[PDB]
Design a protein around this ligand. Sequence first.
Ligand SMILES: CCCCCCCCCO[C@@H]1O[C@H](CO)[C@@H](O)[C@H](O)[C@H]1O
Length: 395
Amino acid sequence: TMPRWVPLLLGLLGSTTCGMLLYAWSVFIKPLNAESRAEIAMAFAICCLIFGLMTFPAGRLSDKMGPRKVVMTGGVLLAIGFILSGFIQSKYQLYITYGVIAGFGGGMIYLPPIATAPKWWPDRRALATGFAVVGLGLGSFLMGPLATYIIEWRYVFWYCGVAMGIMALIAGAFLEPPPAGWKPAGAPKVTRDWTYEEAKGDTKFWLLYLAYFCGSFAGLMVIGHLAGFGRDAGLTAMAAAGAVSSLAFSNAATRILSGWFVDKIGIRVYFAALFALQTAAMIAIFQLGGSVVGLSIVAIVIGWNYGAMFTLFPATCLQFYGPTAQGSNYGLLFTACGLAGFAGPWVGGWLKDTTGTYYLPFLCAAALCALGTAIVFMTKPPEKKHALELEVLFQ
Ligand SMILES: CCCCCCCCCO[C@@H]1O[C@H](CO)[C@@H](O)[C@H](O)[C@H]1O
């Protein structure tokens, strides 16, 4: 067969493509306005919504007809979205090309590897999931110098769309679960994995859904405000921007480190702790946000907690319901993050504008993270289902 570490590289490739898709709009804000920032951000909001919703059908189709078809279709759709975003002329044009097509393909690329990589690593599920999701923290590090090299804009859309289509087709080409019988390794009761209908009907699934929505919303609601908070406190734009930039490093690193850490010690308490820490960070920025060092610390903590969500929620869902229906279960679960990605940033901006001050959005995010802390800490796994219909066999 093939080594079980190959799916990790595949998910790295696919998630890196998705990260390039998500990082594109920030590089395009200035060039596109050259020919309103909020008008541009509407395309990104559409992209987030489409992405986060298309995970659900992507997960169902991955569970039904395998993940290769889904990821490669996603690569086609995204590549089309980017290459067509390159040939745009109107606002709605970019909305469709980037937000819808590219977002569609991006969701279809993102989900199947998150579902597949743990299947090869039953001994290290959270780490493998982290490899399936760590590419999104990379999009900035690879694209930003690349995008600057191309511009210093349509060239970015076209060539990046080609490269992303290629990486996604490579990742999806070699992507498939292990064979049904044997699992890569080095009268009784027979348990079994939950069905998608059994998981979707479970109450803890929606407690996790609610926690996910809250965490994603709070993070997306304040991250855009971190550097503006620093400038309001008295820092120079350069200093505040430098301070907030460490959030990318922590957001990327946490996806692998938290995965490995909970593989070793368990999910629930570390996860709840990270949420608590995010709560404290939303509150603490008011004391630490006015100096490069303090603002950097808050950005790192926000990045760590936020990023950890995207390993720990799929790892938690895998713990609860098992991996056979993980495509459907986590695809459904991720739509929470899709909705938050649509609405959260706008709400943060609106609250700040409404009051003129940062207390309201940060305090609202702290409340959401408190709720998430409570849910994540108090939710223990459900009863492992038994296959009585398979149990009967031991005479
Ligand atoms: C952003 C917050 C969104 C919270 C959504 C909570 C949904 C709770 C009600 O849903 C229903 O729950 C049943 C089992 O509990 C399922 O059988 C059913 O399919 C589902 O429709």
